[PDB]
Amino acid sequence: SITENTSWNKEFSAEAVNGVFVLCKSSSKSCATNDLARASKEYLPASTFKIPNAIIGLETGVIKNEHQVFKWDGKPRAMKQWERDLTLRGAIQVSAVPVFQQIAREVGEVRMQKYLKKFSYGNQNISGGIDKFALEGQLRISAVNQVEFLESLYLNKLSASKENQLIVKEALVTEAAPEYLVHSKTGFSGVGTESNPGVAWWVGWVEKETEVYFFAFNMDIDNESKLPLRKSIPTKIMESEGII
Amino acid sequence: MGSITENTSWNKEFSAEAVNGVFVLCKSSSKSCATNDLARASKEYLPASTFKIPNAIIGLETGVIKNEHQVFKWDGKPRAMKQWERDLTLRGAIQVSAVPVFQQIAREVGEVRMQKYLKKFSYGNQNISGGIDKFALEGQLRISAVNQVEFLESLYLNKLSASKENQLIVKEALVTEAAPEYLVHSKTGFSGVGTESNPGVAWWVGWVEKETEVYFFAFNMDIDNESKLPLRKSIPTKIMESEGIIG
């Protein structure tokens, strides 16, 4: 069950933003959202795919363990902040595309499909190059699906060892307060055209008191200066809900 | 660890606040440690709430603690602190340093099993005498700053005599600060004010994952007044900031 919530609309209007926020308390069986339709509309996951990809890499042996260091080969990378040795969390936090491209390559097409079928991850479409399906390929996932996936990860219910799920879960911690804990991941497919904009994500969950809140946010974006919004809107909503 | 050296440049931070204490900072890659006081780095003090780390690990290994989602339910009886008077997660119980919650864990583990795991952990003098539910706060257990960093490193590398799964669960419960470039796992300790002539101890132990480097730390100080308690975080914080590790 997904229920529309009209009071969150002000945060999208003030910023003139076409997006959606899904927020589920305790479990994914009853979620609230500003837009029923968009909540289940599937977009390029981009860097949010680093979550399932981190689990898959661990399950397949490609990523050797928790303390694996992804070494830089000295060859130029698209961002300067990727041009260094990286940990799992490190690669996840700076969104180190080439690190995860190489992981994806070594997983291979067969195993990638197998695990995305297991995880019920989006349209499960990995076609159009193994190193680029989540960024420019055919893979599509919705905010509701991102939410169901993360709850499985939280509860250790994914088709993977609890060990490997815990490893990724720690790699996802972005905010630690005395009151609450935040696990989250950003995505950004690019700017695209004005007619066909890119997509920006912020997905994750919050552990406050003895309660859990699962969340996923996406929005249309044609200008990178609007990027901070992918965190500020869902944060503003969750702050006014008393969550963070 | 591999080596330790005395570094008296950190004394500035202790001198400013009239604090008698010690900081140990060890770099995982080089296996090398630095401390302002080699002598105190090896002096064994009451772990206080820092014992919650191994206690949580032992609690998860013996099955006394179910999993990472176990709620330590509050019945309704009056407790020593207002912050403890609610239902708490594993992290919550660790963060607020809930004494009754972990006493209950300790008692269900019992002396025999606690002794066994502390031997396996090499945790201080291994003296659990003075009541199963108070040996860490007012009993006979003593651990040093060098011992703590060795213990926490063993936890970090999952080398402790417990399942990796349980060591992961505790490691996340200890996360206290998260930034894009660094991650802080930490635990506070406070044994009480004692007296004017026999001061109490306050701890801050943990580790920082920064870049591909890991920094293990143990801080303690003589404390006779609760007003000086926030100094257990600020002094080592100021040290690690000046080392370029955090902030």
Curated annotation (Swiss-Prot), chain B:
Active site as annotated: 49
Record comment: activity regulation: Activated, with respect to most beta-lactam substrates, in the presence of 0.05 M sodium bicarbonate.
Native species: Pseudomonas aeruginosa
Disulphides: 26-33
GO CC terms, sorted: periplasmic space; plasma membrane
Entry keyword Signal: yes
Enzyme nomenclature, EC number: 3.5.2.6
Localization in the cell: Periplasm
Keyword list, A-Z: Antibiotic resistance, Disulfide bond, Hydrolase, Periplasm, Plasmid, Signal, Transposable element
Biological role stated in the UniProt entry: Class D beta-lactamase which confers resistance to the beta-lactam antibiotics, including penicillin, carbenicillin and oxacillin, and also some cephalosporins. Confers weak resistance to some carbapenems, in E.coli strain C600Z1. Acts via hydrolysis of the beta-lactam ring. Has penicillin- and cephalosporin-hydrolyzing activities.
GO terms classed as biological process: antibiotic catabolic process; cell wall organization; response to antibiotic
Organism lineage string: Bacteria, Pseudomonadati, Pseudomonadota, Gammaproteobacteria, Pseudomonadales
The keyword Coiled coil is assigned to this record: no
Catalytic activity: a beta-lactam + H2O = a substituted beta-amino acid
Residues involved in a beta-lactam binding: 97, 188, 190, 232
Modification N6-carboxylysine occurs at: 52
Protein name (Swiss-Prot/TrEMBL): Beta-lactamase OXA-10
Subunit structure as annotated in this protein's UniProt entry: Dimer.
GO molecular function: beta-lactamase activity; penicillin binding
Outcome after substituting residue 52 to A: Abolishes catalytic activity
EC top class, as a word: hydrolase
Gene that encodes it: OXA-10
Short name of any one Pfam family annotated for the protein: Transpeptidase
Effect of residue 135 to S: Increases resistance to ceftazidime about 30-fold in P.aeruginosa strains PA01 and PA14
pH dependence statement: Optimum pH is between 6 and 7.
Entry superkingdom: Bacteria
Family to which this protein belongs: Belongs to the class-D beta-lactamase family.
